[PDB]
Amino acid sequence: IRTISKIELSKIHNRYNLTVDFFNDLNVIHGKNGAGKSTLIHVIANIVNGDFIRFAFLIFEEIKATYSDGLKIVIRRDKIDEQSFISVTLSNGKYIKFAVGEAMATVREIMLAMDIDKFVKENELQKVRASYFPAFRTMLEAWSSSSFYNRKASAFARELFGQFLPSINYPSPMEIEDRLREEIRRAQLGIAAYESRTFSESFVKVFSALFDNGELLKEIEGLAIAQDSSIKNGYYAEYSKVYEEIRSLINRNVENSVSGALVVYRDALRDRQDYQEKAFSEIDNYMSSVNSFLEDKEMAYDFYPKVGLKFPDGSWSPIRVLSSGERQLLTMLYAASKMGDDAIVLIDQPEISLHIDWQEDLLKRMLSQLSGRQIIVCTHSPSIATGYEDFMINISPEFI
Amino acid sequence: IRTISKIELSKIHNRYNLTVDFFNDLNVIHGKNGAGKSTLIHVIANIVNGDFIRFAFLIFEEIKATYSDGLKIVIRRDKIDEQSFISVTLSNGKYIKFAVGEAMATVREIESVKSMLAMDIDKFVKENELQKVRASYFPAFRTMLEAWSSSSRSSFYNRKASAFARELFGQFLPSINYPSPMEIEDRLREEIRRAQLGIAAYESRTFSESFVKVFSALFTGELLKEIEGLAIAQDSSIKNGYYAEYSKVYEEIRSLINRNNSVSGALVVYRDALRDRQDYQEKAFSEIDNYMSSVNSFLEDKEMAYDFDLRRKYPKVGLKFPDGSWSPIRVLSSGERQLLTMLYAASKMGDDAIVLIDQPEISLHIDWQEDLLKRMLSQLSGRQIIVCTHSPSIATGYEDFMINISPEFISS
Amino acid sequence: SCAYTIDSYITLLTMSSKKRLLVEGRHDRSHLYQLIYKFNPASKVKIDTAQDIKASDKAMSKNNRLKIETIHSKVKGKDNISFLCDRAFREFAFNDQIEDLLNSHYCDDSLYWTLGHSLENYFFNPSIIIDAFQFLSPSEYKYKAIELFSELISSSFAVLAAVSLAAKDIDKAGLPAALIDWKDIVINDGTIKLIRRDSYDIDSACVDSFFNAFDAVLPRVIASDVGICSRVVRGHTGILLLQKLFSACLYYVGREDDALQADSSANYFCNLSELSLTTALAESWVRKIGVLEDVYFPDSLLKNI
Ligand SMILES: Nc1ncnc2c1ncn2[C@@H]1O[C@H](COP(=O)(O)OP(=O)(O)OP(=O)(O)O)[C@@H](O)[C@H]1O
């Protein structure tokens, strides 16, 4: 896919210059205080989202962005006739110049943005989005709970930290709960459709065995024990009873059709178990990644679907009772999940409120979900970057 | 004075208990995620400030707080006939008791003259002397909080920010008592003014005493060089910005002496007067210079300093750059501001308090984390510092003062 | 850089509840991770590297072993951490024959030593080298090259040990890495003879001192036991020396069919990255543990964590 490979900054804030070279899988940016880590993340997020109207609020001279496929974007801020003009130049030669004051007026109002998105959609610059995790995730999550959430939180955060700040669009824990519920409902409906298919399929499978001529019952017993003791079933979970009836009628009653019917029944049980496992594959992988961190609780679902945290006494609690660090762990693992939106994950200070035993495993458990996405983190903590020192990037900007 | 010494929690959120024994100087509290560190800090900050009306918003059974002098505070939440009640019991038998619904109604009306419940709580904590020591609370969310405050505060007038933070994080959160850098700047200006007035009083007293001793005692080469060095050192100080004419007076005295016993006594009392003035200048500016030396050990390309000028009459306090430029303290970054506040809170200029800092490693580089606790303790304030941290770079070198928190989960 | 100091890391040991292992380099971390994951793929041991720990002392800055010894000394008695160092030439006797005074893994309060000179000495079992080189080969004349290499490997270890001892006698440890080239090696009837090439980029004084030390140490190494001899070879030196010896044997036995093809394959093998060789050897070494009784590993270290 398309990944950021180079960012050059010239006279940004009229203060410094900075050229950064990236990897395509993982980048761990680090540097001193005020070195421009957060500004680099903001520039990357605004470029990747195609939100060039943010650049009216940044004082700079030239920003060069290079992607993986060779696409190059050059953004310039010229000053002519005591007016500032933003110039965006692609590698195709197509360009768009718009006035700063018009962009400021559209900001005060919230036409030019329509021209901008037509230019972006024409040149396919929104092929991959960017999930921006700011350094103030905790108070923003607490504020928003007291895409509309993205819009309101973006307005409030740009009110506080300036209008250059990108659109906040990382998955909040309430969004995580809603998407988990939607995936659980879809998995149940998929199980319903698969059962209706295998229902009509097994009738002609049995009908085929009527025209053709021990341990199988034990294997069916094992499959029925596994399915009856499965949390993914809440309804018609009495396979042990019908298995006992079947084995009683077998011991009461050698025809080859009986053995073929036993084969069909074993295949139907294991096939239903296989589709039931593949329907809940992403949810179980995400909850296994989360529950590898939590100590005295376990995130789990139960059936109407309930999604919460089981404690060792069996009591349930909502996701709102989690602490700040545990909620941040939930969000950062969901952004790298397969059920999360495919994007470029930009995290600013992922080490906030995380114990060092979790900081050592955060990047490992994000990369072990095989999302294939590019992850860029800016950290001050050496325990985040341990084990991945080949991907560390040290930025030392040249101040003027 | 009075320092906290033991906190015993019982069934916080009906599931876990905790028992922590503290030290009187420094307590670096660390633990796993979700252990109950921020809840412990909130409990200490509500108890020490005497804001017991917060405890109607916590689900618990019993919380005991023991101080260093032996005063024990026992807070019990009971449910009598489905009606919940908070009972606060001290060690001398004095006690108060109120309803949880009344407290919730009082807090909601404060959202919309104090109530009967607020007046009763304040009378109870005032007549029992429960508010000797304050508690500076540095929250974990302070970096965005000061950004919110700078778009619309002090250690005593912080009602709006505390109300907003309790709106975001629930009503159990204590009041936001940590000093803003504006309060630090104002306090620095006031301390500089007080130091100048004390210097003026010392000048008058030393002038009268030196004239009396001179006139009574009235009826060599090394002394002139020593007095020359003392006058050069007096002239080369920032504190003498209102008067820098010591070398001219020394040269006039030396020229009167050099052209031609009784003069040796005048020379040695002149040297003693210069030494006494220099020592009173160090004493009167001791806390300010110590605090600025603690702060300027962290800042790289700038230094915090004070300035006087005879043309104006207002001592200038702010940042000084090596190229001579002056900028106020608001042009600092977030981490440098955190350093400024966390070093003023452990200083002698700050109020007598128990410094409760939650996550001191917020927005700090790894070079600054290794020196924060050393520079807080080197000011010798005698405070009790309680930090809840996840960073080994904060806590390095203080492994004897580290306290692990492992709550005990109860099943019911 | 963004790394812990000695005191900060000691504090991290106090704060963290995981089972930890401290090793010298990052390559040691990757190899030991494969070794641990063979026995327990779900193991939760976290391995730290002393290479990524800053030291205030200038001398201790690049002395990884001294960092490990300092850390081990200051937390001596902890339960959750184990230490591994490189034995180097410690506990070896050079009294006209190579003698191992331990012949077992060293242990001193969670401080362990590799059985050989370093961690890479575990790779010097002949079966591992064969399997790994066969798997990582140009695939032109692999079978005959492996058969010849399997014949040469018995006596070549004496040559490698002599090279390492000659390097440490004149203190020019990195000298054989750039001095000896695979073309200089000659494949005889089971033996090899690194001819002193007349032309070398390095000065003749270093080359002459190296060959004087090599000649003076070779009969002593020959008289020593082969098993003891295979463990004293320096870890980084041995890998490259085997790479050159295999490039030489491949070109020697494949030039008659096509000299250019053999030379291209030999240069290709010689141009292979060291990291590629170490990873291939590590995979072969992991697979041979438990199959052959002649493959060693730090069993005490694995047992301790
Ligand atoms: N208008 C401005 N907006 C933002 N930063 C600015 C501006 N003018 C100058 N700067 C400088 O840019 C730096 C702040 O940028 P940024 O937030 O990316 O830095 P950082 O290294 O991530 O910071 P920190 O470690 O404090 O979080 C500081 O050096 C600051 O002095």
Ligand SMILES: Nc1ncnc2c1ncn2[C@@H]1O[C@H](COP(=O)(O)OP(=O)(O)OP(=O)(O)O)[C@@H](O)[C@H]1O
């Ligand atoms: N309303 C609640 N109901 C139940 N349990 C709660 C509630 N609020 C908090 N908790 C529990 O208390 C703990 C949160 O307390 P606290 O924030 O002090 O923890 P912490 O150890 O400081 O966390 P962190 O890792 O965020 O620093 C968690 O175990 C959480 O499950």
